[PDB]
Amino acid sequence: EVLTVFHAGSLSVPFEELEAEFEAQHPGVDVQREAAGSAQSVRKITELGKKADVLASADYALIPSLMVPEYADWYAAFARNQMILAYTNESKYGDEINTDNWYEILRRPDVRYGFSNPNDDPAGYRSQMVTQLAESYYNDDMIYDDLMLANTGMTLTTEENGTALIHVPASEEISPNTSKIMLRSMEVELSSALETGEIDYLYIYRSVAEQHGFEYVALPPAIDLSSLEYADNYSKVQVEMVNGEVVTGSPIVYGVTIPNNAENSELATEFVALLLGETGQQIFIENGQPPIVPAIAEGKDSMPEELQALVV
Ligand code: MOO
């Protein structure tokens, strides 16, 4: 019949290849995908009342915080990624940019940069997390102020334990300084802006940069949300969306679930089995998006038995 998949924008390229593989082994199946920012993909199910067979997110923790237990009973952590600052040969100061000086280039008034909507998209809130965490790493308590506070409607407070809390207003009230910032609904619409030279820099994932042939600044492991060992450092920044939901700096870990209100749950089991199996792993390696092999799952007693063999 019809397989409805809601997935992250960074998952577009591997999910296209996964679709072609799934339709080759299942002839009468039409896989319709809706790519959006992960929080918005989750909000399709939990708030708009839309039904999906597969939900895959760029931040696994959106599943237990927003879906469990009304819309989901389990999740499996399947992939990793890394935040970089992407650019081309047409980008200003691209010859002179590195790990040590990226934010000073971003500080310049003739330099325009891009990130996605933090209310809707993990990459959008991660850009904020990366930028704030840079303050303690580089011993410069004005990086977040110069780049984000002076140019948007976002505000910062400090929690009692020392954690920085970024407040995101309504999406229309973010009101970016057009000279400095291009904002988009999802991270994958800004790729066309970086190609044409409309922006100079772009906070996106390493997998996406490799998918477009972009040059990238390899940001430090302490701030780039890539390494498990730096999880205690990443947790010192939180982002609050307009609806009052709080996301926490953590390593970038992708998560999949089959919702409770899925129409084709039996067929959804097979897609996720393909995803977690050796075929799915290979597709993810090829697109520069490190798979978690074997996949880490919670709520295993609620999982289908076919999928229980593939998880930890
Ligand atoms: O969920 Mo994204 O891959 O941060 O549009």
Helix extents (H) in 55-121: 62-66, 102-107
Classify residue 59 by its DSSP letter: S
Burial of 26 (C-beta count, 10 Å sphere; 0-12/13-18/19+): middle
Name the residue at shortest CA distance from atom 3 of ligand 1: 10
Distance (Å, whole) CA 229 – CA 240: 24
| DSSP β-ladder status, 253-257 and 75-80 | antiparallel
Residue 242: how many CB atoms within 10 A of its CB?
14
Phi and psi at residue 40, in whole multiples of 5°?
A: -70, -40
Look at residue 157 and give its three-state secondary structure. strand
The C-alpha angle 305, 310, 312, rounded to 5 degrees, equals 100
Phi and psi at residue 161, in whole multiples of 5°?
A: -80, -10
Phi and psi at residue 69, in whole multiples of 5°?
A: -105, 5
Ligand 1: residue of 120, 127, 183, 186 to mutate (most ligand atoms within 8 A of CB) is 186
Distance (Å, whole) CA 209 – CA 55: 24
Task: Give me the DSSP letters along 224-291.
Answer: SS--GGGHHHHTTEEEE-TTS-EEE----EEEEE--TT-SSHHHHHHHHHHHHSHHHHHHHHHTT--E
Ligand 1: residue of 34, 62, 117, 121 to mutate (most ligand atoms within 8 A of CB) is 121
Q: How far is the CA of 119 from the centre of ligand 1 (A)?
A: 11
Distance (Å, whole) CA 244 – CA 242: 6
Backbone conformation region of residue 228, classed left if phi is above 0, alpha if psi is from -120 to 50, else beta: alpha
Closest CA to 16 of 27, 5, 2: 5
Residue type, 238: Q
Contact 293, 83 (CB under 8 A): no
Contact 276, 78 (CB under 8 A): yes
Contact 115, 127 (CB under 8 A): yes
Contact 186, 117 (CB under 8 A): yes
Q: How far is the CA of 215 from the centre of ligand 1 (A)?
A: 20
Contact 41, 6 (CB under 8 A): yes
206-239 burial, b at 16+ Cβ within 10 Å, e below that, comes to: bbbbbbbebebbebbebbbbbbeebeebbebbbb
In the chain, count H helices and then E strands: 12, 15
Distance (Å, whole) CA 214 – CA 87: 6
Classify residue 197 by its DSSP letter: T
Q: List the resolution, Å.
A: 2.5
Q: What is the C-alpha end-to-end distance of the chain, expressed in Å?
A: 30
This structure was determined by: X-ray
Q: In angstroms, how far is CA 112 from the centroid of its own chain? A: 22
- 262: its two tokens: 């899925």
Look at residue 217 and give its three-state secondary structure. strand
Contact 47, 40 (CB under 8 A): no
Residues composing the chain:
312
Q: Please give all residues whose beta carbon lies within 6 A of any atom in ligand 1, as ranges.
A: 8-10, 37-38, 58, 121-123, 186-187
Contact 15, 129 (CB under 8 A): no
Look at residue 44 and give its three-state secondary structure. helix
Report which ligand 1 atom has the smallest distance to the Cα of 36: 5
Helix extents (H) in the chain: 12-25, 38-46, 62-66, 102-107, 122-137, 143-144, 191-195, 206-212, 231-234, 265-276, 278-286, 305-308
Distance (Å, whole) CA 226 – CA 79: 11
Report which ligand 1 atom has the smallest distance to the Cα of 122: 4
Distance (Å, whole) CA 201 – CA 222: 20
43-59 burial, b at 16+ Cβ within 10 Å, e below that, comes to: bbbbeeeeebbbbbbbb
Give how far Cα 45 sits from Cα of 33, 48, 55, 61, Å. Answer: 14, 6, 9, 15
Report which ligand 1 atom has the smallest distance to the Cα of 187: 5
Ligand 1: residue of 117, 130, 187 to mutate (most ligand atoms within 8 A of CB) is 187
Distance (Å, whole) CA 108 – CA 207: 27
Backbone conformation region of residue 39, classed left if phi is above 0, alpha if psi is from -120 to 50, else beta: alpha
Q: Which residues pair with 222 in a beta bridge?
A: none
Closest CA to 242 of 51, 40, 50: 40
Q: How far is the CA of 120 from the centre of ligand 1 (A)?
A: 8
Can you tell me which residue has the tokens 């730096």? Answer: 230
Q: How far is the CA of 16 from the centre of ligand 1 (A)?
A: 15
What's the half-sphere exposure (Cβ side, CA atoms, 13 Å) at 158?
5
Q: How far is the CA of 245 from the centre of ligand 1 (A)?
A: 17
Distance (Å, whole) CA 269 – CA 250: 28
Sorted by where each starts, the structural domains of the chain and their CATH numbers stand as 1-80+253-312 (3.40.190.10), 81-252 (3.40.190.10)
Q: Which residues pair with 90 in a beta bridge?
A: none
Report which ligand 1 atom has the smallest distance to the Cα of 124: 4
Distance (Å, whole) CA 205 – CA 198: 19
Dihedral sign (CA 48, 53, 58, 64) = positive
Classify residue 122 by its DSSP letter: H
Closest CA to 63 of 33, 47, 43: 43
